[PDB]
Amino acid sequence: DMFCALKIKFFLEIGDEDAARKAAKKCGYSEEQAERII
């Protein structure tokens, strides 16, 4: 859960907005609330 959150920021940190989005969807986040994170 915390790990998943970090995995998302890692993907943001390396570019690849896509993997960030995918991980967020799996992690439990909102499709829309994922747009804000990014």
């Binding site: 970090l6 995995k7 920021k9 390396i14």
Partner: protein
């Protein structure tokens, strides 16, 4: 061939002479020993070794022709004791009879060899290492000394390479059969000590080639070493040093699971005489095993570090797109999107304290993902160094001679009583 006349080595919590000439060796209780053949001379009065040599053999009966070799690890100066360090000479090994013989002494950053003949004539040769380097190869790190003597010259070699030479043609008979006393002797701090290892005396002038061969033989280990030259250990806290980026260190990026690269702070106070970059900085790493705690070449490991309270782990994303990528620094997990397994390597064939860190898809796979290193990433837009994985290193590390300055060359720095900052 049969040129060894003293061969002081460890056996059964003691030091003995293995030369076969049966020197009597008395290690007093104040000498610390370990089974890595290291021994410590301290300021305490019972910290001494007395060697009584065979008194019926003379090995240089007509002309001077002998050598001494040993490894040594000399602690860094104390920042508040620099004047004494610079100026106070202390003997560490003395071999004299009737005011003639030889001695090895230290004055601060200088190690000194001295001959004294029967007429009292004195000659010395010394090696002095810089105490203003950002990163020293010598201060508080194990290094290899060999001194040779013939009719004409006294030479000191360091790690197999010739450093200095003194003309000693005007030296006459030197009495060589005195007791050999290993003991700190001089105006020393209570805290002063020296470590030594593999002390040997030879009855001829060793050639540079011979010396170089012994350097490699005595350096060789199946295990890897730390920054100080000691065996690398599992479950031991380490700072990390990068041989291609000497003044750089790793720190967890603020609110991001990556390792940013920062520049080492340096000696803060105001002595004209010294300079160095700090070593006890950056994340505290720890190596975990995937019967002893020694890390050996080809071992599979986890590279962990402490993030405040938690033990976190160093990963590489399985599917990074370019030749290099930021490593993922995160809690311990069995995630299927990241590789967590590292094989520790030694690609250098020559002695070194550097090691290399290889990610593979799997232990039974020969498929190589990349080596851990440092890379300049562009991300206003700016350049910024990161703790990385890189495929470029994979071919780099096979080139001969080995490139000591590749950013995939790492060394591990534990807290050590011989380095204070």
């Amino acid at each position: 061939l049969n040129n060894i006349i003293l061969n002081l080595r460890y056996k059964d919590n003691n030091l003995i002479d293995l030369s076969g000439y049966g020197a009597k060796v008395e290690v007093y209780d104040g000498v610390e020993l370990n089974d890595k053949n290291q021994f410590k001379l301290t300021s305490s009065a019972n910290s001494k070794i007395r060697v009584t040599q065979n008194q019926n053999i003379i090995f240089n009966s007509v002309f001077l022709d002998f050598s001494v070799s040993f490894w040594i690890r000399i602690p860094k100066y104390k920042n508040d004791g620099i004047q004494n360090y610079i100026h106070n000479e202390y003997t560490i090994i003395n071999c004299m009879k009737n005011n003639s013989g030889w001695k090895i002494s230290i004055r601060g950053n200088r190690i000194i060899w001295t001959l004294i003949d029967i007429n009292g004539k004195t000659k010395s040769v010394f090696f002095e290492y810089n105490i203003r380097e950002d990163i020293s190869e010598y201060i508080n790190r194990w290094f290899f000394v060999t001194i040779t003597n013939n009719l004409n010259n006294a030479k000191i070699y360091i790690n197999g390479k010739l450093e200095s030479n003194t003309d000693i043609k005007d030296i006459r008979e030197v009495i060589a059969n005195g007791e050999i006393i290993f003991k700190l002797d001089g105006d020393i701090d209570r805290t002063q000590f020296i470590w030594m290892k593999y002390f040997s005396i030879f009855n001829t002038e060793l050639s540079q080639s011979n010396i170089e061969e012994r350097y490699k033989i005595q350096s060789y280990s199946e295990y890897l070493k730390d920054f100080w030259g000691n065996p690398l250990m599992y479950n031991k806290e380490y700072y990390m040093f990068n041989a291609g980026n000497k003044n750089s260190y790793i720190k967890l990026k603020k609110d991001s699971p990556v390792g940013e690269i920062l520049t080492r702070s340096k000696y803060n106070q105001n002595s004209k005489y010294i300079n160095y970059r700090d070593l006890y900085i950056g994340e505290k790493f720890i190596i975990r095993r995937k019967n002893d705690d020694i890390v050996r070449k080809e071992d599979y490991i986890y590279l962990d570090f402490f993030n405040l309270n938690q033990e976190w782990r160093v990963y590489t994303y399985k599917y990074f797109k370019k030749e290099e990528e930021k490593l993922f620094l995160a809690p311990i997990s069995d995630s299927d999107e990241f590789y967590n397994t590292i094989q520790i390597k030694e690609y250098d064939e020559q002695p070194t304290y550097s090691c290399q860190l290889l990610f593979k898809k799997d232990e039974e796979s020969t498929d190589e993902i990349g080596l851990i290193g440092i890379h300049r990433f562009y991300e206003f837009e700016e350049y910024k160094d990161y703790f990385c994985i890189s495929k470029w290193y994979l071919k780099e590390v096979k080139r001969k001679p080995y490139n000591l300055k590749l950013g995939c060359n790492w060394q591990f720095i534990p807290k050590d009583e011989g380095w204070t900052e």
